[PDB]
């Protein structure tokens, strides 16, 4: 019977706002920088399980060599 | 040493990735993947994703050799722990419970819908019992198996399946257990107690 | 049948506005009963307040009776139930209310009766623990206040018109009807000034009866609605409201805990400052809150950060004095964010 959620009070204590006044860290965070060097960016390009697992360990600059490799992978 | 450590770890990752390509070759004809499968928790941050992908790409291609390499992996884990801890078997120590936790991690991948879960897991329990009785006991007594702590791992897999086949596995089990082994219940034989409660 | 008319695809709002204004002239009481039923039924209630109940029962007993006949299924109500029909319903709701009030500004508002009834009813609905009534009353009262802001703008404009005619007659110092037109314009100017005083009094009544309870609501969305509409009014009638006396409330609401509310406040602050090429007051407010704004540029919610950076861009446009070196260095480091 009467399956509606009843709300006891709508008042909220001022102390929590005063806490946010003294300490507002709870809505801030630290700046997450993008990778600052080339090495980690090229690694991030061919990184991940699918990309690492779908290309040879020795890079192949000509796609002509890519077709013989990618051909035989079920 | 920042750059050197980053390059060394990535180079290692590339080598292991080439070895995972060889793991696909292991799916066709190679073997001896137990060591790479074992090093999943101690090297979790380096290799969690690769080990998970290897497990998935072995489940989707051949469940049979999947369950083979899984059982050989657990054989390697058990043989390393027994060599490490000798006679006591250190059930109290965290290590063995952590291996059981890894076993639960292995269990999570399995899905009830698959037919092979209805027969590969059955074989897994078969071989886990066989492993528990792999080595015979010199004295005190002929019943108590040594290497016996593997049944605490196998009890973690007996939860999954299955009501009808529980009798069938038990009829296979009676080739290994005896009447007074079934009857006796004490703190050393708790693995069997849990197995019967799971059967 | 008003609720269904507003929901089911009305072909034109102005037509039913004109028909209702004529019918209200025909009978105040029946049309007011329809309005009470309208306010109840926009929250989805299907009960009915009766004529004897309307004229005789007190509002708290009426609202309790409508809780009895609320006939809700869950604790969800139309302002929180999903689907396009309820959003379209809200749009039609605000459109009808605003056009209805804006075309009646010369008669109904000055009857000393309608506003007292509506205010008392909404204050009771907004003080009720039943959240659905309190929510619909908040949005409705904000829309009502915006209509009254238009009333205030229209009144001031008309006062300027009568002042200009007064000044033209102050130029025309010779003429038998000159004294007559000067007196009539003074009479009209005084009547509009007294009317204006009543309007601001009613505005103050609404503000202190609603906003002070609703800037601090348990529901974050209600607080956000309040900040939205105060930004609308100050964008709408800047000359009379853009001072610290009203800014302080915004200052308090800058410390909201929820990102959604911050996004609404940030958008309102961004919109208001861009309105004037040459700054209209608030310099003290900028000095007080600038540093906390530039600290809020690193919000967990990316949209908040975007709004913050555009605010700092406005701070640059207005002054170039307010910014420090460290502020510039911090934002230049923020150019390399992942987002």
Curated annotation (Swiss-Prot), chain A:
Localization (cell): Cytoplasm, Cytosol; Nucleus
Region (Interaction with WAPL and PDS5B): 1-74
Transmembrane segments: none
Disulfide bridge positions per record: none
Residues modified to Phosphothreonine: 74
Region span, Interaction with STAG1: 42-74
Biological role: May promote apoptosis.
UniProt name for this protein: 64-kDa C-terminal product
From Swiss-Prot, chain B:
Domain of life: Eukaryota
Cellular localisation: Nucleus; Chromosome; Chromosome, Centromere
UniProt PTM comment: Phosphorylated by PLK1. The large dissociation of cohesin from chromosome arms during prophase is partly due to its phosphorylation.
Illness: Intellectual developmental disorder, autosomal dominant 47: A disorder characterized by significantly below average general intellectual functioning associated with impairments in adaptive behavior and manifested during the developmental period. MRD47 patients manifest developmental delay and mild to moderate intellectual disability, usually with delayed speech.
Subunit structure: Cohesin complexes are composed of a heterodimer between a SMC1 protein (SMC1A or SMC1B) and SMC3, which are attached via their hinge domain, and RAD21 which link them at their heads, and one STAG protein (STAG1, STAG2 or STAG3). In cohesin complexes, STAG1 is mutually exclusive with STAG2 and STAG3. Interacts directly with RAD21 in cohesin complex. The cohesin complex interacts with the cohesin loading complex subunits NIPBL/Scc2 (via HEAT repeats) and MAU2/Scc4. NIPBL directly contacts all members of the complex, RAD21, SMC1A/B, SMC3 and STAG1.
Function comment: Component of cohesin complex, a complex required for the cohesion of sister chromatids after DNA replication. The cohesin complex apparently forms a large proteinaceous ring within which sister chromatids can be trapped. At anaphase, the complex is cleaved and dissociates from chromatin, allowing sister chromatids to segregate. The cohesin complex may also play a role in spindle pole assembly during mitosis.
Family the entry assigns: Belongs to the SCC3 family.
Protein name: Cohesin subunit SA-1
Species whose genome carries this gene: Homo sapiens (Human)
Gene for this chain: STAG1
Full-sequence range covered: 854 to 1052 of 1258
